[PDB]
């Protein structure tokens, strides 16, 4: 009872502290401070500020937040009269917060906390009115963060690991066939594939204009506009049933579709008989109430702030970010005629990755 | 190479912290919408019943409940043996923290510090690059409203019921009547409480932020005590008179922001009666900043980056920050200013240290 009250008060404080540390990590990533400290090595606040051209007093207070949190270590100085306090980012921590090239990189994701916190007033209203919150109302920082994080694990995983891991896929892509990306987002996946497999006709589908034009610009900057087309709209309606796609990708967006079953039917119509549907969705329990832990809590909070309101505003099914766990993916795929559902090693414990075939 | 187990462990801590951020945003939303108090008072409830009782939409309330049940803040008894629907419970031990402002354990309103200060991220990116401050007036009103909310809760629990009776001789001196001052009077609740309880006292608040000045005046007017409560806009170091007759001077969570803390303490010493009391609330960290450790220190340093330091710089202050006056520094500054008796009292939070200070 009293022990339980004090224990919970501690958990509450820990979570508020985690919120503040998340905001500090997002600031640090935007400012380049984690990469700066990793490359510099053990550093005082003055030397880290000088290296980045930033203000030492602010950098110092930021460092002290992170040394209190154990994200960096500190060797106190000699205020008697190694000089100043010296801070180090451990290599194991830099793999997570500093180096995009690390398969462990998550640093940019911390910006989801401030970017979605900005929508608190909008959700206070929406909880009352029952309306959705259109995608265009969210901060640009949200979509920039989504592109940043997608680019990092796509660069690490798509060509080095996923495509080679899937039987016969690389050979079919080299020969050339249609490739589709449902929810093409920032467009990096299609640029990677178009450069590596120039005989494929690549098409992205996205409902958000900002994403459509970003992906087009990315293709243009890479010189692959002749290989990469972007379509604005809902792939369930626009993905053609030509039975010839060697690959259809769908990362973190099927759960927002207005009619997931309809979307899978469209995927099944597009795929070649030996084509591959590569699906990334959240992990979690088949029964929502059985979910437990930090990953589920994080994802449900993001679901409240973005996935559910934005999908409602588009009149969608609003299943939310946790709305397609493995059992539901398997049931929906069986219904749609996608009979082979296999898990692949996931980029995060947050997600489940599937190789799906007709 | 990399130690994989330590990398995976740190990745876990990072995810735990992002989850804490999301849960904090959900708690702030829930407090604003009254969902915790509704769930506590109604008892075990489905999402539909809770939404209907609060005038809200079931789909949104459901996703909010699932966040909190995943986090273990509420418990859930699943339904569907076809108890039909899932039923959620806020344990009484948890309601004491997040639902009831009357509880001494209440912290629910504080969660709104996370979204309110997150909104200042873009401003701090610029400030890191230019060295400029960020004036207090740039912050969301929700920040100051949250400060008033949380101050009101522990002042109502502690000031008259616990602190004043604990301070030897103070109640009797206030009953007879003497000047009372509040450095950083904020929302004005402390001065209203004392003016109601001890009407022979002349109470004066000092605050540099106009929003606080006018709120404190309105609170006094609403309570019928304007005749006893004056609010002064500006810095108490310059404006607090040296009349040697104040029975009580209060300063809660703001001395560390002053441009010259020693000067501010010197002004307090001049105002106090010889048996007058300076009641000081400050943060409870290490004497050496780099020795700080743990979630409380991390939370406070993050708020210090986002608010305490930039807002004090914008006013040309010393910008010591939220952790800048730990006990060793309080005691050193007090000894220098002639405040010889420094005693700790039981603090409202683990975050803070509370002092009874006398000349």
mmCIF file of C-alpha atoms in Angstrom, chain B residues 2 16 23 57 60 64 74 82 107 125 160 182 206 227 231 237 245 256 278 290 321 329 359:
data_model
loop_
_atom_site.group_PDB
_atom_site.id
_atom_site.type_symbol
_atom_site.label_atom_id
_atom_site.label_comp_id
_atom_site.label_asym_id
_atom_site.label_seq_id
_atom_site.Cartn_x
_atom_site.Cartn_y
_atom_site.Cartn_z
ATOM 1 C CA UNK B 2 31.328 -3.199 -29.177
ATOM 2 C CA UNK B 16 12.158 3.064 -21.875
ATOM 3 C CA UNK B 23 3.253 8.182 -21.138
ATOM 4 C CA UNK B 57 -15.119 9.794 -27.683
ATOM 5 C CA UNK B 60 -9.734 7.937 -28.320
ATOM 6 C CA UNK B 64 -5.381 6.184 -24.129
ATOM 7 C CA UNK B 74 -4.028 1.218 -14.922
ATOM 8 C CA UNK B 82 -18.703 -14.398 -26.412
ATOM 9 C CA UNK B 107 2.021 14.892 -9.074
ATOM 10 C CA UNK B 125 17.968 25.031 -31.032
ATOM 11 C CA UNK B 160 -0.959 25.932 6.947
ATOM 12 C CA UNK B 182 6.860 36.073 -0.968
ATOM 13 C CA UNK B 206 7.304 40.099 -5.725
ATOM 14 C CA UNK B 227 -6.744 44.789 1.450
ATOM 15 C CA UNK B 231 1.886 42.363 -5.548
ATOM 16 C CA UNK B 237 16.490 42.020 -4.419
ATOM 17 C CA UNK B 245 10.123 43.415 10.811
ATOM 18 C CA UNK B 256 18.362 29.879 -8.354
ATOM 19 C CA UNK B 278 12.942 32.622 5.643
ATOM 20 C CA UNK B 290 28.993 16.460 -12.222
ATOM 21 C CA UNK B 321 19.812 26.826 -13.568
ATOM 22 C CA UNK B 329 25.656 26.367 -1.840
ATOM 23 C CA UNK B 359 19.216 35.514 10.951
#
